[PDB]
Amino acid sequence: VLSPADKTNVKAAWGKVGAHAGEYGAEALERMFLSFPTTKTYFPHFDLSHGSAQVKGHGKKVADALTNAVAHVDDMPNALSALSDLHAHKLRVDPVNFKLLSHCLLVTLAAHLPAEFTPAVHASLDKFLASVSTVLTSKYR
Amino acid sequence: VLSPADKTNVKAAWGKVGAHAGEYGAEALERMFLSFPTTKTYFPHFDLSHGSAQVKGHGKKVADALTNAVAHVDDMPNALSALSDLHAHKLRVDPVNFKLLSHCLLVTLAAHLPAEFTPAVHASLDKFLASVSTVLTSKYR
Amino acid sequence: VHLTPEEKSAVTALWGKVNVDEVGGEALGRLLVVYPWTQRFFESFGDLSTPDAVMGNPKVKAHGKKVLGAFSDGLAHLDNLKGTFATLSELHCDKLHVDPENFRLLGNVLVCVLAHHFGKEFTPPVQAAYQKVVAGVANALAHKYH
Amino acid sequence: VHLTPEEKSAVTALWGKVNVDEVGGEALGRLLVVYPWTQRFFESFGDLSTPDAVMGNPKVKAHGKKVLGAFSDGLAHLDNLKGTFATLSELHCDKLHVDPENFRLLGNVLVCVLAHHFGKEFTPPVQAAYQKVVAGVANALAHKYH
Ligand code: HEM
Ligand code: HEM
Ligand code: HEM
Ligand code: HEM
Ligand SMILES: CCCCCCCCCCCCC/C=C\[C@@H](O)[C@@H](N)COP(=O)(O)O
Ligand SMILES: O=C(O)[C@@H](COP(=O)(O)O)OP(=O)(O)O
């Protein structure tokens, strides 16, 4: 569960992301594909080369979903309902992969938010991404 | 989340386990220690030899907690509250280990329940043990 | 894999009592029932909507025999699993796009199936030997991923 | 998957710019804050009740420096990680009773700290090389467990 402190920490850090959201999402994806190539098994229909427009486009979608989750942190299950339906019934990404993208998102944030990425915020963001991952895999079976 | 059918399946299988719960808990522990040696790091104070009284005693405790969870299957977070506090604040067993003991419990039940360990029951018991594990690590941070 | 001579013998002694075709169908079928997201690679297999629909699905059974038949042949080459599974590794990555985590889940389902079928004979030490085997096979199938 | 010559060069070039004292303290500190259950091995270190107490704790900093110091020395043996960490592996298992999963969590935290410190220079390719490095080190420290 996310404590009041976690919510405040997440809102502050993500708020700083601002117009860079799509950029950071795309960067996080690239880091994941390079660091953990098995995650590429889910995007055989994508050009995964650097600068790929498909990756950039997907990075934006992922970032917007996270923004939506932050804005509705008190009720993420309902806010992300269609998204959890999509991953459970269609995409069916193995649950093990979510921590991989979560880790890469954290790395991306650390690389771009030197002042805001304090140990407490890092902890809050890790918990937050875990919560989002849990909601997204909640309908799997 | 456990569906009505999942609960019917768990109650049927655990009901057949009956008086052998403690023995099965002990067997599950022996299987875990042998197949996944790293789990032994949590029991340096134990005589982990085959048939040791400490493993038998601990197996009984684990099995009893599972029996309690089954008896309160629609209220597990509350029924396992004290146990969740204990693992989170004191024992602090890394979360990755719960799937290891759960796997060994399933193996133990498969080896002892030839008639009832059907594919559907297997599926329901895997979800049940995952639910119990989630509850037991829910207060970790 | 790091099996002791006594574990390699245990593995082979038990496997010689296994009906590979049957166990293959049972393990693949249980994988699809227990972890339903794995059905994502079998959209051409037809009805997989209920446990019986999956377990008795003739294509699931046929594929199970193919999969475990290869696993079985791999057991005759425990000292060279990466080499023996090299082309199947390349195929699963480049053509089938199968997340290697699926090999690990199948391995755990296989261990549960062996315990179910053999009962008490599937002792704790015997299980430990088989856990090393399924992990080794899974690692060999994941080796050529890139 | 080991390191390509280029990846090895990437690792060493970045590491030559690392203040191991600071990165070590920061890494262990963040480990105890982000995954608090890891505090179970350090009850004699004193106050670890808040993020500031953990990061400022002198024993946490002293231990972070010791641990990362050993990690640093290991980087000179990238071709024989198991051999160079063998005694430490046996020690963490037999005397310290440290679940090797802890090595993987520290690895994750270390990557985040390197990214925090280097910013844009910690590029995706550089991250990938370091991910191979921390996995290899964790695997080496876990190798002698029994
Ligand atoms: C932080 C967790 C994640 C979030 C917030 C997330 C969010 C999303 C969103 C917003 C979409 C677009 C849906 C649409 O078209 O309307 C999507 C699609 C998808 N996601 Fe997830 N996702 C996450 C993790 C994952 C992971 C771990 C993978 C796999 C490694 C993954 C693979 C996919 C794939 C393959 C698609 C389809 C993209 C396409 O075909 O264009 N997702 N996800
Ligand atoms: C199926 C999930 C699990 C259940 C139901 C469970 C249940 C319990 C129970 C009932 C106790 C006794 C508490 C008391 O004395 O009141 C306990 C203690 C303990 N558990 Fe858990 N546990 C689970 C998983 C784990 C795992 C995965 C590990 C580590 C591999 C673990 C390690 C311990 C340790 C070391 C203790 C203390 C034993 C002692 O000092 O006597 N538990 N657990
Ligand atoms: C012990 C591990 C496994 C072995 C040894 C194995 C072996 C094989 C073999 C021999 C084939 C035929 C290759 C061909 O068509 O040329 C095959 C095909 C295939 N395998 Fe694997 N496999 C394993 C695990 C899995 C798992 C767990 C999945 C995913 C849930 C999977 C999905 C597939 C798919 C989709 C095909 C193609 C089926 C089709 O023809 O439509 N495999 N595998
Ligand atoms: C990169 C991984 C790590 C390396 C290379 C490493 C290295 C070391 C070294 C060099 C020592 C001194 C051994 C001696 O006395 O001869 C040590 C002690 C210790 N390490 Fe590790 N370690 C690592 C990760 C960890 C982690 C993640 C934990 C647990 C969260 C841990 C817990 C301990 C403990 C409790 C001690 C004993 C401290 C004391 O003397 O009070 N280590 N480690
Ligand atoms: C020669 C025999 C060929 C048949 C073998 C079948 C292999 C199955 C294909 C593996 C799928 C690659 C992953 C594709 C991406 C998906 O995650 C989503 N785009 C769509 O969801 P989703 O497609 O998962 O619903
Ligand atoms: O050093 C190595 O070649 C292997 C040892 O494993 P085995 O080949 O003995 O199974 O390391 P790993 O690929 O597991 O990281």
Residue numbers in the entry:
A (entry chain A), B (entry chain C): 1 to 141
C (entry chain D), D (entry chain B): 1 to 146
From the primary publication:
Sickle cell disease (SCD) is a prevalent life-threatening hemoglobinopathy characterized by a point mutation in the β-chain of hemoglobin. Indeed, S1P-conjugated beads successfully pulled down HbA and HbS from normal and SCD patients erythrocyte lysates, while sphingosine or lysophosphatidic acid beads cannot, indicating that S1P directly and specifically binds to both human HbA and HbS in erythrocyte lysates. Thus, we provide biochemical and functional evidence that S1P binds directly to Hb but requires co-binding of 2,3-BPG to decrease O2 binding affinity, presumably by further stabilizing deoxyHb and increasing its T-state character.
Expectedly, and consistent with published studies, we observed 2,3-BPG bound in two alternate conformations at the dyad axis of the β-cleft in the ternary deoxyHbA-S1P-2,3-BPG complex to tie together the two β-subunits via interactions with the residues βHis2, βLys82, βAsn139, and βHis143 from both β-subunits (intermolecular interactions) in symmetry-related fashion. In both the binary deoxyHbA-S1P and ternary deoxyHbA-S1P-2,3-BPG complexes, S1P was observed bound in the central water cavity, with the phosphate and the amide moieties located in a pocket formed by α1Lys99, α1His103, β1Asn108, β1Tyr35 and β1Gln131, while the flexible aliphatic long chain snaked toward the β-cleft making hydrophobic interactions with α1 Phe36, α1Ser35, β1Lys132, β1Gln131, β1Ala135, β1Val1 and β1His2. Interestingly, besides the central water cavity bound S1P we also found two additional S1P molecules bound in a symmetry-related fashion at the surface of the deoxyHbA-S1P-2,3-BPG complex but not in the deoxyHbA-S1P complex, indicating that 2,3-BPG binding most likely is required for S1P binding at the surface of the protein. Specifically, the phosphate moiety binds close to the α1-heme and located in a highly positive environment formed by α1Arg92, β2Arg40, α1His45, and α1Lys90, as well as with β2Glu43; either making direct salt-bridge/hydrogen-bond interactions and/or water-mediated hydrogen-bond interactions with these residues. The highly flexible aliphatic chain snaked along a shallow cavity wall making hydrophobic interactions with the so-called “switch region” residues of β2Phe41, α1Thr41, α1Pro44, β2Leu96, β2His97, as well as with β2-heme, like a molecular sticky tape.
